[PDB]
Ligand binder design. Structure first.
Ligand SMILES: Cc1cc2nc3c(=O)[nH]c(=O)nc-3n(C[C@H](O)[C@H](O)[C@H](O)COP(=O)(O)OP(=O)(O)OC[C@H]3O[C@@H](n4cnc5c(N)ncnc54)[C@H](O)[C@@H]3O)c2cc1C
Ligand SMILES: Cc1cc2nc3c(=O)[nH]c(=O)nc-3n(C[C@H](O)[C@H](O)[C@H](O)COP(=O)(O)OP(=O)(O)OC[C@H]3O[C@@H](n4cnc5c(N)ncnc54)[C@H](O)[C@@H]3O)c2cc1C
Ligand SMILES: Cc1cc2nc3c(=O)[nH]c(=O)nc-3n(C[C@H](O)[C@H](O)[C@H](O)COP(=O)(O)OP(=O)(O)OC[C@H]3O[C@@H](n4cnc5c(N)ncnc54)[C@H](O)[C@@H]3O)c2cc1C
Lengths: 593, 592, 592
């Protein structure tokens, strides 16, 4: 009979308060412009169908995909070179959610949709891009094999192999399949140690003929993402019968291989290690040593870079989607959080300074958003055989410009976004820093900002009059400006003036370069930034002029995008070659030689 | 007898090539502007002493500290609530290299130099900040307790407690010590669940009087870094004899406590958990449950906020140091890499696009670097009693401005830097991403960009003196311009034009009728950025114009900073209340 | 044009050789004695049903479960106190394969089979234990909640609560279900800091009446496994209306609770931490702080201990299953390996020393295996109402004996087994060490070897009936001996001689004068081992003597078990009180 001690067992008191975090709303319904943009680009019959599918998928993002993608971050891939008995197996361990995510992509047709023969090509790419844009920031980086997979189908089909070449026909069918138990994905192994940007100088993989169009590959692939994929595309240097190869782009042939034989065993490949990455941690990225890998030559010998170009538009568009996804997502989470976090006696949402900051992020995102859907429209026209000459040229211009500009927007924007949450933004267990770490891949891979900026110049250097064509496209967009609204008129005038300046500078540049004292490369980024802003601005304007869909916000946005920041930031003197000498004196001041 | 099988055992061949990564060079010698800046600011005999100490420390950084900081990232702090036998212990497990870093801070006087009696305060804060600046990007986040440590010293001293108050006097003395065996660090525990930033409205810790000036604390600290520190400052509401307290700022009193007791046992504190952080992973940051932690009140009752205000200038300066450290570091690594990485047949260093990219990063860095040293200058003066009115006012203005601007430059700059490395910049095992993850703390803690922008507005609202003095300071800097140089001249004009326009807009927004339709808080960031750019611009001109040290890069950077990006980005129509409504519509379009 | 470099990219060569590891064969078909034992014990039509179900499950074990169990070791449970936003949640993170294992338990009726109304209880517990035995070494410790689950069913039923008590009836029904979507598991939270084993003196949990039969619990559970269960049984002291309670066994009442509420939220419970365990790493074991956990009292007030006593037989049987599972498993793997590993020019299987080592392990395993099935037999009989006096008494005696003996055989046996593999037996990635680390739980939990040895003594002290009945049971087994066989005959004699000597020593120790100078607790283990060996011996003889099933190995094993190691290791002089003094001196020599 002692005194009871119930009182001596008691949970810790912590004050009662804890902050409610942000809510992810249905990302199709909650998106500011996506639905409206679709109202305008698609025909009525197709809009209903597409909206319904996307809106439903929105609900799957919130109830299922988000959680899956999160788990893929929490349970990262591993590699075991060996089993326990001394046997080399290169076992890749990836979590169930990654696999489930690949299956949802199949079921949801994230690839299929972009190729469905019963649907108009222009419709389907716009549907697909909208779907990828809902998926991407919840994807746990399954978005990356989706991109390479789309790019693979694209490449194999542009080379006219589907129906004719055994493995490519099978690949195409499987890569496009909506059957989760049949569907394939693809990798893409271009980057090597000596160069990634530079494939003609970097690639030291060699192909020895076994028989006919079947070769052995031997080389080292320095980044190879999604090694759980079923097939891959890669470049290599065919070895002629005297044991020799060609340097440069002219040495490179293109090959398709199955990653694993029918026994589940690696096909002449050893995984040297998995990368330890700032972000995309969900994604297994390996270094590969090829040593006898059996592969099939596709496309013409020495025509390897040409072969894979066929997919540029694709991959880059997907990359842009990712960038934009991160941007939209942080805004979406931020603004929601803004209705719940009390500071100095009211919700963040009430403080002018807070809304100013977010509004500017909105403005910039909308611009690029519409640039993205222009790209998707254009790709689709091109795939239908219905491109005007101008639309064909715009497709070639817009893709690198889009990838690099959205690319460069993304980290600063997402960085600003997480700061909206204060300290919480910085805590990995909220899910928010993932968005930053993963966003930062987007300006780096598939071409850095500056390498793509050169690609933009190389688009110009090819020469049907890209620039004139750029001019006409802009003019079309400006032609139905609601000039009666004072702000849209001013906007139209800003875009117009900027276009006119850019033309003048590039005309000037083009003349002066034989004289030696002019280096257009040096300002390639500013050039590419300018095109993006002009193009994006024109689209916002056209968008805000459709009063069947436009609201007031659309008008404010067009105005702010066009007139409250420079459309062109580019000066003649930055072209001067002397400028380059000044550049290096600055950079290399006191550098220890 | 059998055929040998030496051929069957063979390492893998992987092609012979692998890329040389970047070299970290002596960061005092390699820095493009730090030596020249010190040359101008210090009298020659102090410069010589200071340079030699830093040059040497540069070597210690490449030979030792860098590696130490890297290891503190590779071996992150852990926390164990219980020992194995049911005992609550809260064991904080932190790697040896963290500890070693703390001792190097003592050995190298990273705190001491700033308070050395026998050196002039001017000299000494310049020297200190320079040293803090070399240290910071190699510190594995030991930079953070150093900041909190310096702030603690400043706070304790400014309250006139040295000599009088036993614990604060022991604290000051140990926080400043060069003896690794004795030196102390401090934490600072303000932030709680309901508010960081907003401490007046978010602080829900309570202090019950034990005897005279000794209290027990009960509350929950939501972020508390360097829980391996020895002392900490913190705020709490004293509970009266009806068992009641005061809401708002007026309730809060400031307290000093020892973290652990003579026994190594936590003083009424539990560690609930360590934070899982994007960056500053080296640094142990915990949540703390205070339940009878024994603490000495310092400063006056209900004057807790004022009390810790004395340390702002210093904390903020340290923060800016961090930002700039990352900026300088990435540029330094990248430039080096650029002489080693071949792309299309040449090293990156020969591609104009690549150096265009870098030059612009350099330009912006230098502007802020000088801004940093002007703050250091102004702080040292303040502490010597020699400040003019102008200079006293500039210390108040520059500190929040500097922190927020450098803070907001840092992530986009470091992001661009890691992109110079291509895919390798994205690999954690290079050490490069750490720079970015760690840089991202800087615009967030100790006030977000926008919160500090509001502070900037408080500094000058509605006190016309502050901006006129900014005016005067700018003119002092510009009056030295080598106007013979066309670029410096245009530069000067640009600064003039911008300063003017700024002053006009703020006068106009001050108009007591204009105000109904006018929200200046809305553009607080633009305002603060403009101040930043104008100040920094002017400082770059002054620097370029000193012929005893400047070179041609100096002129060129000054020209670019001032004339090739707007110094003022601020329009009258952005002050309109109506605009706010438009902002909201844009932001909450389709919001569900 | 350049010279190709295909020769410069080449995998490493490592000599061509690597050892084939062991194969897990269908563990029902491969088992040397399980099928024959079932053949003898079950009527043919039940055997046929049972074998087919097990044979099939054998395949499911090699094709699926094994891999699942391995994964539950590779992906250990984790616990998160807080979510990211300051909320206390106690999230238990356990791998998919654990969950999958639990569903296979439901699908395969690992609990259901033991309670199936339409099958005879005799049959069904034999079938169940057989199934438990195939499952156990592949279960990734899901075996543990299965034991606690079966014990819960038995307890709830034996208290005559099925039909009457709402929660217990729902519980019983869900614990027995084959529907993965509905099936439940149970925990059992007895052990506290002051005592496991000693619950009467160590339980410091308190139950305050809410209403009628519903109470709130406040206390600290020091070990609580399978916190992913749905319900749990536990003991606590009811607090009276003076706010007082009863020390000792009499205070304790037994309670039934739901672990989480309709919302998935813990019922007044926090998880303080998960244990870091030598083995059973698959299994989530936590320490629990009960603070207002809502619970239904079941059984009578102060009858908590009696209440849970009904489940001992069953829990103990499950434990022995585990021990034997590990023993069988290692032997099975090792023998296989032995047909694949060449040492000095032959497979290990051809080296007599190697097979001598294994034979002795086999001999001992089989003895205990039969002991296990005799327990199963006796349990099923008890539950059918058909037990003779002898058989009722043998159930009580055999259960602690079986658990402790198998428990003490297991680590040294599995240790010898892993040594058969040489260095590979010491490698975690083979899966083999898991066997040893997991086996080591078995002599420790649910009573240590010595604590259960004291229970064995309680079973028979001072109740002369129990040993006479052991006597009778042994004679029943021996009366069937094929005495025509010289080995079985000698065997029989050995058992006789030993049983006799045992009975004499215990009579002698019972002498009320002898007792002053006599400590029987001192030799409790020897006593219990002797009972074990005698019982098992006799069972091996009986088995060997059934010509319809036995083979020559059976005879030989029986002979070796009985005649090649002492069945009794127990001398009269070890009972002496004086001896105790000598024991202490030896043990505490130079103790400081
Ligand atoms: C790694 C780390 C370690 C830390 N360590 C410590 C430590 O040791 N000690 C300590 O005291 N603190 C520490 N902190 C606290 C840090 O200072 C806070 O996180 C900071 O106050 C940011 O605010 P918050 O976290 O309370 O978020 P909140 O202030 O809730 O939200 C910030 C957001 O609200 C906005 N906002 C707030 N007020 C206004 C306004 N009036 N007008 C417009 N917008 C507004 C901001 O602009 C920002 O977007 C740490 C933080 C981090 C990330
Ligand atoms: C997470 C991740 C996953 C990846 N997965 C894959 C994959 O599955 N398959 C694959 O093939 N690749 C993959 N990559 C590789 C990626 O495409 C390369 O990183 C990219 O090609 C850049 O190449 P690099 O890393 O060699 O950069 P480098 O080109 O060595 O360096 C880039 C820097 O050099 C500058 N530069 C380069 N050329 C020029 C020039 N001509 N003029 C001026 N400046 C120039 C760039 O602007 C940039 O600053 C991956 C990368 C990452 C980060
Ligand atoms: C992995 C694991 C999980 C567990 N999970 C649970 C669970 O879910 N629920 C639960 O209730 N319990 C659980 N237990 C508790 C387990 O039954 C106890 O650990 C057990 O009671 C052993 O005793 P103890 O831990 O209290 O040690 P103690 O009993 O303090 O010490 C045991 C030692 O004392 C000796 N000893 C004790 N009494 C005597 C005596 N009278 N004479 C001579 N020697 C004596 C024993 O022989 C032994 O040497 C778990 C244990 C483990 C290891």
């Amino acid at each position: 009979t002692i005194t009871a001690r119930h009182t001596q067992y008691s949970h810790a008191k912590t004050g009662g308060f804890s902050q409610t975090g942000p809510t992810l709303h249905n990302p199709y319904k909650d998106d500011p412009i996506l639905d409206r943009t679709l109202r305008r680009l698609l025909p009525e019959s197709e809009y209903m169908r597409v909206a319904a599918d996307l809106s439903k998928f929105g609900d799957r993002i919130t109830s299922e995909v988000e959680h899956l993608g999160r788990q893929a971050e929490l349970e990262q891939p591993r590699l075991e070179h060996q089993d326990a008995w001394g046997k080399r197996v290169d076992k890749l361990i990836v979590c169930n959610e990654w696999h489930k995510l690949k299956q949802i992509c199949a079921e949801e047709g994230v690839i299929s949709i972009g190729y469905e023969d019963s649907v108009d090509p222009f419709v389907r790419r716009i549907h697909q891009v909208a779907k990828l844009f809902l998926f991407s920031p919840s994807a746990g980086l399954v978005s990356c094999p989706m991109a390479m997979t789309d790019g693979a189908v694209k490449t194999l089909t542009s080379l006219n192999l589907y129906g004719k070449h055994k493995l490519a026909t099978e690949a195409v069918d499987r890569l496009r399949s909506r059957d989760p138990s049949k569907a394939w994905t693809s990798g893409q192994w271009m980057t090597e140690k000596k160069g990634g940007s530079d494939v003609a100088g970097g690639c030291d993989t060699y192909a020895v003929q076994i028989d006919k169009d079947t070769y052995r590959l031997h080389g080292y692939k320095w980044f190879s993402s999604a090694v759980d994929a079923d097939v891959a595309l890669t470049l290599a240097r065919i070895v002629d019968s005297d044991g020799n190869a060609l340097e440069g782009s002219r040495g490179l042939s293109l090959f398709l291989l199955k990653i694993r034989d029918e026994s589940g065993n690696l096909n002449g490949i050893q995984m040297v290690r998995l990368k330890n990455k700032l972000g995309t941690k969900q994604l297994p990225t390996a270094e590969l040593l090829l040593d006898g890998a059996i592969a099939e030559r596709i496309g013409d010998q020495g025509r390897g870079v040409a072969g894979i170009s066929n997919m540029l538009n694709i991959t880059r568009i997907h990359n842009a989607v990712a960038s934009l996804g991160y941007m939209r997502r942080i805004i979406s989470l931020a603004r929601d959080y803004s209705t719940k976090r009390v500071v100095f006696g009211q919700t963040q949402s009430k403080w002018p300074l807070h809304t100013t900051t977010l509004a500017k992020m909105e403005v910039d995102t909308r611009g690029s958003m519409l640039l993205l859907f222009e790209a998707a429209r254009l790709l689709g026209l091109s795939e239908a055989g219905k491109s005007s000459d101008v639309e064909a040229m715009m497709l070639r211009l817009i893709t690198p410009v889009l990838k690099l500009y959205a690319g460069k927007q993304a980290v600063p924007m997402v960085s600003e976004g997480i700061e909206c949450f204060g300290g919480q933004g910085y805590m990995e267990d909220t899910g928010l820093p993932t968005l930053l770490r993963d966003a930062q891949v987007t300006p780096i891979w598939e071409g850095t900002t500056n390498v793509l900026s050169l690609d933009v110049l190389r688009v110009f250097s090819g020469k049907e009059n890209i620039l004139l064509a750029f001019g006409k496209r802009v003019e079309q967009l400006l032609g139905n400006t609601k000039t009666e609204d004072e702000k849209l008129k001013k906007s139209k005038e800003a875009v117009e003036s900027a276009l006119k300046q850019l033309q003048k500078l590039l005309v000037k540049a083009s003349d002066s370069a034989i004289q030696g004292e002019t280096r257009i490369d040096s300002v390639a980024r500013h050039i590419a930034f300018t095109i993006a802003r002009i193009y994006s601005g024109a689209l916002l304007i056209d968008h805000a002029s459709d009063s069947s869909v436009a609201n007031q916000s659309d008008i404010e946005v067009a105005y702010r995008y066009c007139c409250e920041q420079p459309l062109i930031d580019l000066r003649w003197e930055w072209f001067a070659s002397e400028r380059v000498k000044a550049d290096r004196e600055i950079v290399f001041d006191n550098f220890t030689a």
